[PDB]
Amino acid sequence: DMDRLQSALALYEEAMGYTYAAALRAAAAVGVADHLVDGPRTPAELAAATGTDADALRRVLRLLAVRDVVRESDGRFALTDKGAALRSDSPVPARAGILMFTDTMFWTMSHRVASALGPERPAFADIFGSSLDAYFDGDAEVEALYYEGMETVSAAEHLILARAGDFPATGTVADVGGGRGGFLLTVLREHPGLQGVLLDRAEVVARHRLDAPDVAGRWKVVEGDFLREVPHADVHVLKRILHNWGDEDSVRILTNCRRVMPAHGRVLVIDAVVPEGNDAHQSKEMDFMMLAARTGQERTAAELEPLFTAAGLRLDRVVGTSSVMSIAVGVPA
Amino acid sequence: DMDRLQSALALYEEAMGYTYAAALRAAAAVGVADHLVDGPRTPAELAAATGTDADALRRVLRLLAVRDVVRESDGRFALTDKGAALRSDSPVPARAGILMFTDTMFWTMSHRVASALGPERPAFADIFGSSLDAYFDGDAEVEALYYEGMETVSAAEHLILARAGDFPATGTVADVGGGRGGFLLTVLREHPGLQGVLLDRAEVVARHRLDAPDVAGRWKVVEGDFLREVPHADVHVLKRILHNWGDEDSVRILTNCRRVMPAHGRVLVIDAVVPEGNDAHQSKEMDFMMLAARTGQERTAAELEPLFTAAGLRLDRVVGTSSVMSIAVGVPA
Numbered sequence A, B: 001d002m003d004r005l006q007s008a009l010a011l012y013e014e015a016m017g018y019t020y021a022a023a024l025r026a027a028a029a030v031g032v033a034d035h036l037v038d039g040p041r042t043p044a045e046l047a048a049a050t051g052t053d054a055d056a057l058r059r060v061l062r063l064l065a066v067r068d069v070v071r072e073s074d075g076r077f078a079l080t081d082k083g084a085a086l087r088s089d090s091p092v093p094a095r096a097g098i099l100m101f102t103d104t105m106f107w108t109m110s111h112r113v114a115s116a117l118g119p120e121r122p123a124f125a126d127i128f129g130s131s132l133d134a135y136f137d138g139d140a141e142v143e144a145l146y147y148e149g150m151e152t153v154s155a156a157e158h159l160i161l162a163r164a165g166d167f168p169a170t171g172t173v174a175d176v177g178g179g180r181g182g183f184l185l186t187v188l189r190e191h192p193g194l195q196g197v198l199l200d201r202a203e204v205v206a207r208h209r210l211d212a213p214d215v216a217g218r219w220k221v222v223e224g225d226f227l228r229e230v231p232h233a234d235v236h237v238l239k240r241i242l243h244n245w246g247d248e249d250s251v252r253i254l255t256n257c258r259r260v261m262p263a264h265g266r267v268l269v270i271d272a273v274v275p276e277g278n279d280a281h282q283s284k285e286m287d288f289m290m291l292a293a294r295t296g297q298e299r300t301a302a303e304l305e306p307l308f309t310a311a312g313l314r315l316d317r318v319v320g321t322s323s324v325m326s327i328a329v330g331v332p333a
């Protein structure tokens, strides 16, 4: 509700919206949060500790306080609850994830999305000037950043999803493409009566972290290819899987689950399900980033349905959580 | 007010905040707004017109609807009031400004702000891989984008600032560094009794747009260097000037105004004055961008004061407007 000139002004403001993420990146980069654990400090004090230019660091912190990451009073900045995960002592430090989501690749590909809208759908290499592999094989520490980034990001949602998941008291859970086993581990710990099977590529399962004393006797691991087949289970789990795959592969994958699924069985597709409507939701921003990277797409509830039906399943219900992730529950149809 | 894990999740969300600006950039790039003037359209229809991939363009529009730039209903997107200035038929089209604020240079320098926090304060060339000149002299159309971008952005704030400015009914207004004269022109049109003098670099004044019939007999133009001296006036104006200059130059400039200022005279410093506090304000984001570009800084009311006093002026009051711009009013002290 505004005139054409105010429109322009509002759009100029929107165009600079990327600065916040830029500031967060810098803050996590220098690691100023660690020096705010003792209490509110001054730009000078924080600068000495970082160590950086005061007047400069100040202007970054000022913009971040707008997003309630820090807060200023009497010339001092304090770390807030929202900014807490910037601390290195955090169970799940946000640094790796922040540095990854704002990494050169994503930052660059997001910038060239205009070029990515081509009618024929250009590939990654077209837009970036290189292959994705060339990018990682060019800088070792960046490849390291994505592994750690992906690992911590998922680790932050696990407990929520384990408690929100409709899990049986006994039976077997197959985490299909479960990575290094983090989610399966959390699920086992939350439901003592469950057995678990981890499936993923050989090089991945070789680095799995399921072998903890408290879950001894409750898990096995399998090198496999969920495009070809998956293990039998009372409950199948597909987290951050389908969103990497085109439409037919997804059915192919879901079908592999249905094939080895019992009558009382269920498959849990866990992804950033995109809500219909015009309201803010992180699933939409993630979706944009997989648009920019020309690889992957986030789906809505109505979009998942056709895939379940095609796999001999019925999308019984989608279950929202306190995270961007939701659980699409499919049963034998 | 949240736990350490939710902190992480909230920070992951903040880290992706740049996607909105990326989407706006793409939307303005392809110019989809022009095809929404007839009414709500479908992603397919908009795609044919743009012309781009439907499923792709759809995902961009979806993210933009979150910022109320477009709006979806029954599979159709409509242009909203906030998005209106995306239309090419606008008095001040937002496209140039959007494309500039998200241009490669700013986008890149914002990304390397961590490197810019060095204790000794690195220069532009250090961080970008080139000089700023090399950048423009490397692409002609980008230099063209910044001129048009800067021109339209300022044009959008002029009428607001002309009406908000405390202008005498008669007398002479010197727009010191007034660019191509846009603001002075608007001021003249709003206050018929005023005379005006435009000062700027020779190459700039040579391209001034003050010569319109309706203000004949009311303006002259002067090639000059406000570092050395400015013309006598009942009212001096400095818009988007001081924020480019270090501290001493600014006093040097203000002093040049005071020198040729009458008893009843006043100097109007018009800039994105940064408000104290932790609340959102575009002056803070602009400030961050001049941090990233290693050139310029936005100031607060309390920061401007010392400069006025040092110039023989008294900062009488700062006057906020309906724009990010405010008017710091200095009088002879």
Ligand SMILES: Nc1ncnc2c1ncn2[C@@H]1O[C@H](CSCC[C@H](N)C(=O)O)[C@@H](O)[C@H]1O
Pocket (backbone or CB within 6 Å): A150, A154, A176, A177, A178, A179, A180, A183, A199, A200, A201, A204, A224, A225, A226, A227, A238, A239, A240, A241
């Ligand atoms: N053809 C295939 N067969 C089995 N696993 C695959 C596969 N292609 C990819 N994957 C695995 O699927 C995973 C998707 S990303 C990791 C998802 C993990 N469940 C989590 O929530 O964190 C990757 O670990 C990848 O190694």
Ligand SMILES: Nc1ncnc2c1ncn2[C@@H]1O[C@H](CSCC[C@H](N)C(=O)O)[C@@H](O)[C@H]1O
Pocket (backbone or CB within 6 Å): B150, B154, B176, B177, B178, B179, B180, B183, B199, B200, B201, B204, B224, B225, B226, B227, B238, B239, B240, B241
């Ligand atoms: N030494 C100098 N003397 C006079 N003008 C200068 C100058 N250095 C820069 N400028 C001019 O000051 C202007 C600042 S940017 C344009 C500001 C204009 N008043 C507006 O609000 O849109 C530029 O046009 C630039 O050409």
